[PDB]
Symmetry: C4
Subunit: 81 residues, 4 copies
């Protein structure tokens, strides 16, 4: 069900944002922006992890986030069109 996928993406977003903020020390706004940019796999590289923990964290975010986000946008696609 699409709504459940949405909930998974929301959980991923919180995880991404909190982690970047507390591991890398960026603001909450930058961290959320980075989370979206990373999980949509856009990844501008204006922000990126600079510590070894941040890098490991980024890899797990990638593993949890990218699949979940892809299915969310295409389920949203189906629903609105």
């Amino acid at each position: 069900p699409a709504t459940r996928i949405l909930l998974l993406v929301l959980a991923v977003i919180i995880y991404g944002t909190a982690g970047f903020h507390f591991i890398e020390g960026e603001s909450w706004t930058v961290s959320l922006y980075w989370t979206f940019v990373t999980i949509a796999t856009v990844g501008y590289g204006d922000y990126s992890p600079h510590t070894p923990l941040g890098m490991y964290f980024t890899c797990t975010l990638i593993v949890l986030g990218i699949g979940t986000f892809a299915v969310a946008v295409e389920r949203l696609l189906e629903f609105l069109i």
Copy 2:
């Protein structure tokens, strides 16, 4: 229908381009180039939002753009091959 998807991508492009131009202050050419680069999820990071509004705007563009663009290229694929 493929043509309707195309229209959605065109609307997304206009939205992306106008927004980056007026929120971030880049030229129209740069803004359109950034829109394509962002919604195809290529995202070089030569251009990126630098304000909190631009960042929020970028996230919504990502949500509206990436799904629409993916389906457009693959429907175009089917049509030409």
Copy 3:
């Protein structure tokens, strides 16, 4: 047929590489590397178009390249596994 898709990707690669070389003035090696990095939508941003023509060219490359490349890797996936 997978082989025909491969031929399309090869044509896209030549187009991408020649264009970046002659429009942006990078070496042939850099241009090919940029073409792959762009059409796989990896896009590091170590190389990017700096002229208005290069930017327009990049958008058309994106439109022609990304769909073709995606289907090529997944058809290659099927064939080898």
Copy 4:
């Protein structure tokens, strides 16, 4: 079978990491981080190949990695949801 795909992604990861380390001279941590960031097609451009060999290597990594990684995350998606 999903587990076999996982094994392919693990092999790709080792290949990516060892190659970047020995070709480009980055640490093992940076090389692994770059491998994930590249094969998920996130590609921040904080790290990128700077030699002609590294660039050729990156293209082959892209060809081997991106398809394998995409199918792995979506098979993982199915398994956990």
